[PDB]
Amino acid sequence: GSFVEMVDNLRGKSGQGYYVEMTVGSPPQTLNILVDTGSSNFAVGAAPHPFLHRYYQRQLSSTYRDLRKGVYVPYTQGKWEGELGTDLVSIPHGPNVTVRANIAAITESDKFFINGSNWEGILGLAYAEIARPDDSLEPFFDSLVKQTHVPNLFSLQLCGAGFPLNQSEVLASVGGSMIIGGIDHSLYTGSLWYTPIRREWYYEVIIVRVEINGQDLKMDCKEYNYDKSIVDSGTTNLRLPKKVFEAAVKSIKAASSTEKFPDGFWLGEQLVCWQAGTTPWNIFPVISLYLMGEVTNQSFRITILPQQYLRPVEDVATSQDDCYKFAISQSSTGTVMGAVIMEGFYVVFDRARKRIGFAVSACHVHDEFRTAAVEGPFVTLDMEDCGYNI
Numbered sequence: 001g002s003f004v005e006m007v008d009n010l011r012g013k014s015g016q017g018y019y020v021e022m023t024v025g026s027p028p029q030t031l032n033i034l035v036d037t038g039s040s041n042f043a044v045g046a047a048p049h050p051f052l053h054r055y056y057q058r059q060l061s062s063t064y065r066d067l068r069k070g071v072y073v074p075y076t077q078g079k080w081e082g083e084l085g086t087d088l089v090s091i092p093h094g095p096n097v098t099v100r101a102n103i104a105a106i107t108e109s110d111k112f113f114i115n116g117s118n119w120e121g122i123l124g125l126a127y128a129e130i131a132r133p134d135d136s137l138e139p140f141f142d143s144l145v146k147q148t149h150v151p152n153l154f155s156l157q158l159c160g161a162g163f164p165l166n167q168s169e170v171l172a173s174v175g176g177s178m179i180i181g182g183i184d185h186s187l188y189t190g191s192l193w194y195t196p197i198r199r200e201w202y203y204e205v206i207i208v209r210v211e212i213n214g215q216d217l218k219m220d221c222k223e224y225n226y227d228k229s230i231v232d233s234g235t236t237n238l239r240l241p242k243k244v245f246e247a248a249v250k251s252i253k254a255a256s257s258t259e260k261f262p263d264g265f266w267l268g269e270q271l272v273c274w275q276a277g278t279t280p281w282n283i284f285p286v287i288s289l290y291l292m293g294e295v296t297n298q299s300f301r302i303t304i305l306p307q308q309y310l311r312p313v314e315d316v317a318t319s320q321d322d323c324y325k326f327a328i329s330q331s332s333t334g335t336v337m338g339a340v341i342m343e344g345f346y347v348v349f350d351r352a353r354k355r356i357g358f359a360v361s362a363c364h365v366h367d368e369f370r371t372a373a374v375e376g377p378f379v380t381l382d383m384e385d386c387g388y389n390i
């Protein structure tokens with residue numbers, strides 16, 4: 001590892017998000033910021049909120065610049081309004097540089113901040129195309145690269161603990177690493193395999209084949225990327241398009257048929273519990289996603305275990321049982337490779353070479369019988385036809 005200063009700079013968990021410490025303004029105001037590859041705005045709480053114990057105070061920053069423009073950002077579940085400005089921004093456990101970046105100062109919000117998440121803002125790491133209000137609002141990473149000598153690349157190691165972390169534990173635990181400008185070899189084992197970034201807006205990729213315990217889901221590959229497939233550190237679940245979700249759940253049910261689970265479990269609503277240490281990992285299948293390779297007609301696969309897709313949760317009765325929720329769910333907006341995928345792998349967002357790399361994570365949870373994997377190459381034809389077009 002050549003980036004010791006950035007290794008282990010993340011905290012949090014899949015259910016509430018992984019965050020990095022940043023500073024905004026002069027003198028520096030410390031805030032915890034959600035690492036989000038699924039959006040492109042740097043937006044921070046800038047007014048009192050019940051779930052915030054701190055926020056950005058523009059009046060206390062001598063370097064604050066008012067852009068005299070508001071922003072209204074409505075999501076599916078949650079929304080926020082803010083005021084656009086610029087200020088000096090740094091990442092203490094990051095590159096040793098300070099940059100002037102756009103900041104959306106959140107003045108009003110609904111279901112945006114998460115009680116107990118320990119973060120006060122979001123760092124949208126995707127491209128300008130999806131920035132709000134429009135693509136003229138330069139994203140943080142674009143500003144960072146343009147103003148410094150930091151290489152146009154970052155890499156994420158999200159570390160699921162494999163068990164529930166209480167309030168105190170989640171604050172004292174290392175949640176992972178965000179390496180700005182490089183690849184740290186201590187965060188992964190084996191080889192890195194790269195898939196092309198199809199288009200620069202979200203981190204869009206193309207899935208060419210899906211298997212459940214080596215059994216091909218056998219769907220037209222276009223279904224897997226309908227209407228897009230993205231890598232999103234800001235989503236908890238592995239989200240699948242409706243038809244893909246229906247086919248995958250049927251196959252996961254069939255593979256795990258020695259034990260029957262209620263519909264609410266498969267719906268990701270209800271947890272399932274087993275006596276301490278008896279989780280029957282072996283009855284649940286592995287899931288492989290084949291991604292388009294960098295070489296013509298070549299693909300590779302990333303394989304996750306139930307230790308990635310079964311999210312550890314504390315039992316309602318805080319008993320000694322090991323409990324989980326099913327962390328694969330349906331989407332009407334394409335595939336979303338969220339923390340379920342990301343926790344299995346070290347993920348390299350190689351913007352300079354328009355590609356995303358995957359390698360087995362040094363912090364993925366597994367058992368003595370199975371491990372997550374990144375393998376290749378495979379001969380795969382007409383992979384371009386797997387990509388969806390409106």
Ligand SMILES: CC#Cc1cncc(-c2cccc([C@@]3(C4CC4)NC(=N)N(C)C3=O)c2)c1
Nearest residue numbers: 014015016017038039232233234235236339
């Ligand atoms: C892993 C993880 C996580 C996580 C947990 N709880 C809330 C959030 C959380 C909180 C606020 C906004 C967001 C968003 C919006 C677009 C900016 N980021 C994102 N990629 N997605 C799909 C969102 O809805 C996520 C993330």
